[PDB]
Ligand binder design. Structure first.
Ligand SMILES: CCCCCCCCOCCOCCOCCOCCOCCO
Ligand SMILES: CCCCCCCCOCCOCCOCCOCCOCCO
Length: 772
């Protein structure tokens, strides 16, 4: 609806940028088409379709309305063939906002090269979970989004950390509004597995090898979380939710201009959740606050500052899985799904807070530049106590391990980039040149020297977490890790012919880790980027890419001779076809991909079987591995009210000897979610469901009381979801979510420290949302 506008007659470029701004809309236009053109003047309360048409009066330009984006074009009488991937300047650097798009498919995205492109133009597997997806299925946190993400397998470490795989690999790359965090290990990484969705517009996942913007990082995927932004019109909501096992969620989200002119603007959100669980004596309080302010210094420079906060506060935390696989004499334990090996008082609370500033400037060039400053904190307070070992013993006793770790990581980021169009051989291309620096400092205390503790409980079968807390004694250890990343990067997208676009670039990287371990240094590392996209129809394009990444190894991954291994490196090879239907409203993709890892840390059994250097008691050995596989996906509008997101992925990852690895990631998986909105007398009703299936998965785990290895399998299984919403009122709606409808009982962890974990049993959630 109607928006306050005031854009005077200027260069068509500026006008278009000032429009997207004033209108909360992404505006895409071709540099060589708006050169030397004038916007006509607009002033007052206007409907955005009426406002853009006025603005373009005189320009000979056409508008394509596409949801939260408009593309502008300048039809010629000549027009002699069609450039679908023509170089196009964008007004929102991060992409198309997904909020209010009614869609499960995204618009534009800069996840791959910091160039704003569409899924179809991106020569890499890119899946997005959109704001409407999160809304409809109740995905209230990053674990929820991941479970619903095509390609992704979420498995458990314990009640407060999950693991995400793509393509053979745990994901350990996270970004916020396009800024990587340090996630070397779980000290730096507190809370990453727990981000509440209340403050995000979408989560965008780039799959393969993502060196080019992540820098040093894991193989497999990057998870990029995009924050909600302030708006030009006043709008907010309150949401209230109630579910299986005294799960109560509430949520406030307010957005608007804070001055008559609306040249300062703001958005605020808060959300609180207190929940018990199907797991006995586990409970979790979670708190999030987010505030962001936008100042327009003038028509082409905007200062933004903002801050976020999240506290994740549990009781009944476990260290590793929900119960021990084998008992004292080495039979397998049968236990209720409610069983929780955590102690009542045990807690792995994880907290995160960010303060950030950015500055963005439109050069007349058609170029835009942007500096991003960040102060981030990932903190933790972890007195963990939990039943551990081959228990029960024949008399039903068992033994608790208890250890305390507290600590904090402070991170500072500088990121600066320049992006813009340019002409080479009578045709238009774009460039990004950026440089980055991060310093992060992990500090901590460990307590493992317990003073006068009795770690035995006399009743395994009826365990309850009702065991005393120990005297933790004095600290055992103080941590001091310093990581310093420096990056410089460049990607050109050449529009070679009307059907061929060529990506050429890379990143140079300097990585230093300092402190209590010996110094880890990589200098002048080059991370190539080669990509092409070739158009075949108005509908389909093929693409190929070659992408890369490395991660200097952790300090403990040393060899025979006590030298650290060379960095864990991989290259992703990918060939593919993507399809685009209904003016971008529906996307499809089919891809073939191959990952070549070199220097993967491997144990080194012959040495470890009787070490010879007391300096490395547990040596590694750097080896090779290959992931081969393919993936299919679709997302968007099937028919007017009808939305899907579905994927199919196949993988086998082997190491050079031939043996299967990440065998707990299934070799085959499939996701489909969908909702439908009736038209007619039922137009206030939205219906929906979904299903996730995966094949066989296994672990090899060591039965230590019987001195043999065992194979633990999880037979293929489906999970089904259902969902419905009714818009009772222009302002008020009611929803219900049923998850795991057939109550399928399954495992999300087998073998992590010789333990296992169930997945959620059937669970409901009721909600009301109220929009002011
Ligand atoms: C260096 C640290 C800086 C921290 C910055 C934190 C920013 C927190 O501020 C929150 C601002 O939110 C603005 C919320 O928008 C509300 C707009 O509605 C106002 C009422 O409506 C007026 C008439 O329409
Ligand atoms: C072991 C768990 C088995 C439970 C299975 C139950 C499945 C039944 O689900 C159907 C629920 O329908 C109940 C209808 O309730 C209406 C929801 O309205 C929302 C409240 O409105 C808020 C008003 O402001």
């Amino acid at each position: 609806q109607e928006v306050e506008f005031d854009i005077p007659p200027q260069a068509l470029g500026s006008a278009l940028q000032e429009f997207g701004r004033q209108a909360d809309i992404q505006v895409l236009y071709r540099p060589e088409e708006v050169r030397n053109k004038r916007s006509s003047a607009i002033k007052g309360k206007l409907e955005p379709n009426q406002a853009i048409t006025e603005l373009l009066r005189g320009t000979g330009a056409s508008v394509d309305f596409q949801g939260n984006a408009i593309t502008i074009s300048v039809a010629e009488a000549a027009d002699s063939s069609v450039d679908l991937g023509a170089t196009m300047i964008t007004s929102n650097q991060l992409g198309t906002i997904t909020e209010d798009s009614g869609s499960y498919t995204p618009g534009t995205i800069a996840t791959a090269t910091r160039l704003v492109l569409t899924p179809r133009e991106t020569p890499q597997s890119i899946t997005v979970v959109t704001r409407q997806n999160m809304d409809d299925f109740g995905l209230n946190n990053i674990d929820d989004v991941m479970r619903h993400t095509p390609g992704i397998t979420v498995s458990a470490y314990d009640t407060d950390r999950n693991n995400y795989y793509a393509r053979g690999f745990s994901i350990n790359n996270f970004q916020y509004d396009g800024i990587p965090s340090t996630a070397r290990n779980v000290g730096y990484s507190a809370g990453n597995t727990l981000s509440d969705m209340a403050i995000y517009d979408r989560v965008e996942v780039l799959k393969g090898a993502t060196g080019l913007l992540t820098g040093a990082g894991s193989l497999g995927a990057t998870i990029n979380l995009i924050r909600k932004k302030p708006t030009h019109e006043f709008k907010g909501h309150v949401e209230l939710g109630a579910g299986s096992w005294d799960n109560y969620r509430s949520e406030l989200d307010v957005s608007g201009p804070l001055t008559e002119s609306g040249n300062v603007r703001g958005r605020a959100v808060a959300a609180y959740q207190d929940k018990h669980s199907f797991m006995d004596h586990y409970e979790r309080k979670t708190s999030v606050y987010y505030g962001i302010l936008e100042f327009d210094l003038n028509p082409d420079t905007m200062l933004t500052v903002g801050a976020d906060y999240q506290d994740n506060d549990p009781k009944g935390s476990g260290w590793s899985g929900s119960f021990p696989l084998f008992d004292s004499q080495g039979n397998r334990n049968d236990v209720s799904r409610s069983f929780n090996n955590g102690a009542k008082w045990s807690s792995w609370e994880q907290y995160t807070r960010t303060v950030f500033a950015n500055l963005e400037h439109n050069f007349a060039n058609g170029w835009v530049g942007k500096v991003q400053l960040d102060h981030k904190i990932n903190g933790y307070h972890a007195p963990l106590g939990a039943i551990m070992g081959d228990w029960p013993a024949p008399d039903n006793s068992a033994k608790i391990v208890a250890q305390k770790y507290t600590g904090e990581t402070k991170s500072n980021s500088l990121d600066i980039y320049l992006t813009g169009p340019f002409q080479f051989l009578g045709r238009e291309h774009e460039l990004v040149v950026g440089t980055s620096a991060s310093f992060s400092h992990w500090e901590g205390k460990s307590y493992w020297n317990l003073r006068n503790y009795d770690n035995t409980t006399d009743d395994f079968i009826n365990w309850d977490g009702d065991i005393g807390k120990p005297d933790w004694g004095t600290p055992s250890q103080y941590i001091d890790d310093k990581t310093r990343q420096l990056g410089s990067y460049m990607t050109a997208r050449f529009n070679v012919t009307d059907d061929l676009n060529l990506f050429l670039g890379g990143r140079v990287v300097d990585y230093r880790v300092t402190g209590l371990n010996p110094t880890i240094r990589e200098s002048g590392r080059f991370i190539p980027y080669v990509g092409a996209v070739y158009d075949l129809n108005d509908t389909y394009s093929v693409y190929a890419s070659y992408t890369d990444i490395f991660m200097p190894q952790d300090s403990w991954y040393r060899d025979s001779s006590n030298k650290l291994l060379e960095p864990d490196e991989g290259q992703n090879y990918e060939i593919g076809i993507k399809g685009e239907y209904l003016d971008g409203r529906l996307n499809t993709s089919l891809a073939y991909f191959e990952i070549h890892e070199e220097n993967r840390a491997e144990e080194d059994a012959l040495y470890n079987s009787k070490p010879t250097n007391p300096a490395i008691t547990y040596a590694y050995k750097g080896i090779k591995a290959k992931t081969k596989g393919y993936e299919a996906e679709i997302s968007g509008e099937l028919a007017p009210g009808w939305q899907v997101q579905a994927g199919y992925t196949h993988k086998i990852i082997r190491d050079d000897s031939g043996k299967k690895v990440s065998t707990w990631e299934p070799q085959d998986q499939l996701s489909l979610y969908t909702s439908y909105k009736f038209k007619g007398a039922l137009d206030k009703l939205t219906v929906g469901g979904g299903a996730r299936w995966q094949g066989k998965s296994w672990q090899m785990v060591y039965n230590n009381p019987r001195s043999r290895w065992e194979k633990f399998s999880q037979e293929d299984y489906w999970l089904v979801d259902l969902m419905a919403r009714y818009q009772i009122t222009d302002k008020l709606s009611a929803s219900v979510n049923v998850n795991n409808v057939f109550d399928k009982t399954y495992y999300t962890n087998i073998g992590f420290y010789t333990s296992a974990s169930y997945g959620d049993p059937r669970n409901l959630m009721f909600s009301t949302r109220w929009d002011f």
